[PDB]
Amino acid sequence: ASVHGTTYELLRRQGIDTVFGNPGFNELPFLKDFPEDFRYILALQEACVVGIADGYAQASRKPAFINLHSAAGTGNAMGALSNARTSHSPLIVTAGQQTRAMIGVEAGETNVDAANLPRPLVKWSYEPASAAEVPHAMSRAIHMASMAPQGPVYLSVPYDDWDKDADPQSHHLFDRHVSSSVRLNDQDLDILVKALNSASNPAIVLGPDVDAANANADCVMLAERLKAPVWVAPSAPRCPFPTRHPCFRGLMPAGIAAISQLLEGHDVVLVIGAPVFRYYQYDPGQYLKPGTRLISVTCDPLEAARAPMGDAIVADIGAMASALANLVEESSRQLPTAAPEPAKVDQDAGRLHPETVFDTLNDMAPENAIYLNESTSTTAQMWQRLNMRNPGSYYFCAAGGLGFALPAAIGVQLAEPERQVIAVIGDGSANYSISALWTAAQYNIPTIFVIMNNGTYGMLRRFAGVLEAENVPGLDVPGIDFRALAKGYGVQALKADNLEQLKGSLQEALSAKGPVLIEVSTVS
Numbered sequence: 001a002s003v004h005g006t007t008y009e010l011l012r013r014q015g016i017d018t019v020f021g022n023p024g025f026n027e028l029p030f031l032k033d034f035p036e037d038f039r040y041i042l043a044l045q046e047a048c049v050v051g052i053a054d055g056y057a058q059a060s061r062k063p064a065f066i067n068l069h070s071a072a073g074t075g076n077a078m079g080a081l082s083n084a085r086t087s088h089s090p091l092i093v094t095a096g097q098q099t100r101a102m103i104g105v106e107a108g109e110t111n112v113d114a115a116n117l118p119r120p121l122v123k124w125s126y127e128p129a130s131a132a133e134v135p136h137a138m139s140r141a142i143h144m145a146s147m148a149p150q151g152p153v154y155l156s157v158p159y160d161d162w163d164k165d166a167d168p169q170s171h172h173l174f175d176r177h178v179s180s181s182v183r184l185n186d187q188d189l190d191i192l193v194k195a196l197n198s199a200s201n202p203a204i205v206l207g208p209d210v211d212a213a214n215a216n217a218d219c220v221m222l223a224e225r226l227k228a229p230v231w232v233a234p235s236a237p238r239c240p241f242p243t244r245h246p247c248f249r250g251l252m253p254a255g256i257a258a259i260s261q262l263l264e265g266h267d268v269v270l271v272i273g274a275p276v277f278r279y280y281q282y283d284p285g286q287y288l289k290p291g292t293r294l295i296s297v298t299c300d301p302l303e304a305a306r307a308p309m310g311d312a313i314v315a316d317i318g319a320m321a322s323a324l325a326n327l328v329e330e331s332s333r334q335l336p337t338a339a340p341e342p343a344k345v346d347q348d349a350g351r352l353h354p355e356t357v358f359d360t361l362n363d364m365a366p367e368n369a370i371y372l373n374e375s376t377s378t379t380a381q382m383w384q385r386l387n388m389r390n391p392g393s394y395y396f397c398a399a400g401g402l403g404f405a406l407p408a409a410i411g412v413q414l415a416e417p418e419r420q421v422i423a424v425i426g427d428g429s430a431n432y433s434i435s436a437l438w439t440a441a442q443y444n445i446p447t448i449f450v451i452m453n454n455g456t457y458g459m460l461r462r463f464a465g466v467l468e469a470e471n472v473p474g475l476d477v478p479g480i481d482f483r484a485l486a487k488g489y490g491v492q493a494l495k496a497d498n499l500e501q502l503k504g505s506l507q508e509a510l511s512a513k514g515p516v517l518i519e520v521s522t523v524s
């Protein structure tokens, strides 16, 4: 058996059947003789390849396999990998290297010091010392990606390795199963349970790791039993709780003072699957007010170490959520009251307020719709106005890198064919990974793309204000025709210059057999 044959057998055996890629010289000996049980998903730029794999991985809650071309291909995907690091996305990033005999002279397409390139974004990076080590290197890649805390890994393979004889001993890798489904020991778990049972005014904060583990339901049961209000942690890359549930308090503001104020009065704050905290704006103050103690459950040692306050437990979010939900007592406390219904804003028959767009989407979209956000100035309004009852219903770039949602929406739609994906993307954001559209068209992945066209980098103008930053150049993006871009890449394009045009376009897009892009003329 060749290294080619053995690697594809290992991928097969580890449950991988999809290659997200953009091909190159160095990848031809990998991609040739492409097995019938695999599918190749081509994107036109490596940001878009990784974005699609990333969405695919997060929705399927399984590793996604990527093949890129050397330094240039790997480099083009670096922004995407930044998002993948923070989302703990299980991505196997493979890249072809020049033939072993030509690495020394640095022939064209040589990836120099290959393993250092993706650092520090990946959890593991590697170039095998020999062709016969490639399957073992791939096994390490798979498990390093899949073990908590999950994350992107990188493997560089000299193109001449694939044709070589594999080690017959490589067969022991095929069915390797590694488990990170661990929870705190009974003694320390009973202590934690007894502290939640005893809390006067408990508060729960959930991060993306809850949605990643599908711990949503256990957290709902946990919140019901403790009769406790629930927030999603700041800069939320995913939605870990039903947003119209009585306990839900919404998106936490990404500020130090703001969060301590919010938690004031809460004796015990339980944070699950979230960094403590992903602060964004400089909001100096106390991390916690007196009388509030914090306990953080995280699957990431880095997040436990980084926390400027509270106690931490490093464990599987799924296993811990299940354990806590089934062990805590029913509080005699009354269930928190559901948040108020959002206000309908004044809307004329002209350019649309973001609020109008989100109200419209909530009325018209299927109850199991999946949303992606890269409309950077409208995130707060989106969280308030979209009723997301089910797991895996929301995705935002984890590291805030733009160019995620458009590709990611295609990967989510591919993973969830029976759930309508609707990506709400700003006019600025749409450009970073615009070429991703071609993939939806070519593979007939029926993602709906809603472009919020305000002519500007809205969020930067708003932040310019907060920073008192005047005469900043490059904040406006006029003269972009998103329907012409969609047509450029074979995607049906509709326009919505007003509410009746929005209602029409959406009903059309919801009944379309293919991807549809709606260009929405939004205010400001």
Ligand SMILES: Cc1ncc(C[n+]2csc(CCOP(=O)(O)OP(=O)(O)O)c2C)c(N)n1
Residues within 6 Å of the ligand: 079, 374, 375, 376, 377, 378, 400, 401, 402, 403, 425, 426, 427, 428, 429, 430, 432, 454, 456, 457, 458, 459, 460
């Ligand atoms: C790769 C990358 N480049 C730049 C930024 C900085 N950035 C943050 S928000 C933003 C503006 C996005 O504009 P748009 O999608 O039109 O949404 P709006 O702010 O108008 O709602 C930019 C450029 C980033 N986060 N990532």
Ligand SMILES: [Mg+2]
Residues within 6 Å of the ligand: 426, 427, 428, 452, 453, 454, 455, 456, 457, 458
């Ligand atoms: Mg904009």
